[PDB]
Symmetry: D3
Subunit: 154 residues, 6 copies
């Protein structure tokens, strides 16, 4: 039992009631890696809402938060800006490894993802890009890294 994890799905349509294509996948992958998943929170691609969702999880003592979406370059891709405000420190290695793995698998939104990763309070927070391939490959890359960091934070 590695810890507690939360999925934050950053998508306007999903926030407004549409089917969630990312939450169950990330839940399945997190559960497989030994996490108990608190649930999935869906938020608009809005800086205030994203920050509030991340901060709420940190205050709540979650071990791992994985966000999905909002890491591209269109106007509304504000997940990295939001995440930057709430991090006490960055673990660049996590974002580099995820980008490196995405690029060589030809998953372009992962290879170029502006997503961040770091520690806020005692919580590891990681932004993943929104595509299903990005989600699968990012989690594959994250598995050994998250266990190590959470163990150190405990």
């Amino acid at each position: 039992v590695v810890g507690r994890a939360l999925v934050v799905v950053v998508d306007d349509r999903t926030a407004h009631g549409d089917e969630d294509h990312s939450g169950p996948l990330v839940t399945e992958l997190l559960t497989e890696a030994g996490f108990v998943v608190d649930g999935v929170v869906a938020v608009e691609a809005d800086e205030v809402d994203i920050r509030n969702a991340l901060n709420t999880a940190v205050i709540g003592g979650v071990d791992l938060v994985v966000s999905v979406g909002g890491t591209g370059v269109t106007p509304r891709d504000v997940t990295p800006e939001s995440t930057r405000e709430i991090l006490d420190r960055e673990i660049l290695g996590i974002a580099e490894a995820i980008r490196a793995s995405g690029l060589s698998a030809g998953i372009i939104d992962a290879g170029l993802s502006r997503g961040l990763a770091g520690v806020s309070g005692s919580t590891l927070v990681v932004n993943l890009a929104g595509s299903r391939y990005a989600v699968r490959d990012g989690m594959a890359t994250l598995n050994p890294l998250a266990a190590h960091i959470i163990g150190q934070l405990s």
Copy 2:
């Protein structure tokens, strides 16, 4: 629709009627990549049985065969030795990319997998290691590569 796929699961306990963990996962991932999955064939870790299952798949005209397991180094891991004889041309780039990806993700049985990849008739054949993480990460790496090869073989 990219083409037709078959899954071969190399495992003694499965071939004797224990629960199959890999077949449904590979099928899920194949279908997601746009393949129609003919089905899953479970085979003992027997050099001849493996080679005949693969050979039956080729003769039957399937576009992609993915095998799972029997690629380590115990006397029983005979998958690469089975597969070698049915291959007309090896595509070393697929096996290398699978291994390099496994290694950076800390997936040791993938990083050290002796699995082959190659063309048999008009069928692309790829051996994956048996761990769940090896299955996931190997399929993520193989996705852009299979599509290209099958396109080239059509």
Copy 3:
């Protein structure tokens, strides 16, 4: 036609009217990637001059600016410092991929390049190191990445 490109060559000897080696190469490579090259602007290694040349390029609506030189570590390599101020968002994945590629090819000024990559307005801006090998290998790495970003920005 993928879009319009500008080349900025950061070099004192060139800005003073010596032969330009990089401009024609970058133009050849840009055109090959499907860009229309507006032209080459030669600038001194002056933090302000560089930043204004880049800024003029952005205001003029060009899709891709590639600069060459001034990304090492002498007091005179001020390209990244110029570029930082005009960037709205950094795309760290481009700079990382350029460096990792340079490093495995033994191209040290590329592997250690302090060059940035990011979005300014609707313009993608990328700093390359100044060696001929750095220009070639950086453009090979950038090709799939620029196309995707400009597509996303349109």
Copy 4:
């Protein structure tokens, strides 16, 4: 002055008089790296002709032979089979590095190239894939490797 080099262009159409799109490029890149280029030989995608062209260059004391084309998976891609017969020993590192670099640059014919590299007599022979991107990225990767091996062979 690193040594003497020969370009072997493996393409049916080019052998039969069509414009050569690869020869001048490889010549330019070889010359840039310090080689004197003997010329370009164009051959059919035929095992006998390819072998004869490679062997002729070896007997002739060429330091480096770069072939271009015939490394894919269609029936007529027989460059690796031809090259295998004439090599005394393989340098797998060259083919791995070229494939690794091609994959992460999204150059699929390079990432999956079945091209070989090795020593025949005192000659380094390297098969590159046929696309212009493959040619450019392969040469970038080959530059430091060829100089090292040729120096050892002397």
Copy 5:
């Protein structure tokens, strides 16, 4: 013939128990590896995992004209892991490619403290400073990666 010497180096060991007189396991190793790469090693300085102490040790080396400072330790995520924060303050500019190469190499060798190291690399005055993680494998692998980079940077300076 000192003709092929690359320059002067200093090792900074960031470790509390070492700062209080416990046997130093990192200093001699980094010294051996620096010397083998052609650096003349001034010595090893032990400091506590304390931002001011780390910062003072680095400033002294910079003021002293040392070409290469390699620190060892204090690059994880616990609260005492303050080497990067101490280092950032004294850097004039960062050389991202060094830290990226150390991490990428660490990750493929299964050296997790190296793969995740928040250690920085960059230039302060004319001094190259590189933070490595504390485990023995991080030190060894970090130095293997640093060898071809440091010498090039110092040459440029």
Copy 6:
């Protein structure tokens, strides 16, 4: 407590001048690195760059029940570089991923003899055999890469 020992190792130094009594620079280093990774080191055996001598040294180790043989040298492209040809003959199967990881790591660290090494890796009976290139940087970097791989292979055997 010998509880966490991974297994027994042997070092084979392939070098002509060392085989004829010149100071061995590789044996002690590989021994140090093997011991640090949890291997108990039987010793170092020096042989000439000769196919029969190399092959005999390897066969003796295999017959002896050694878990890991690391050879050093004879992996380039000159005519005396015969370690891979000697090794291929005694291998039951190859573990391509080891040789690929050593080369990829060597290449990014600018260690060209490692990046281009024709050295093999594989299993002979119950013995893992890995050929490394001869330079000091190849030995160090090769071992950093081998550490997480060897222990896993031996466990499986």
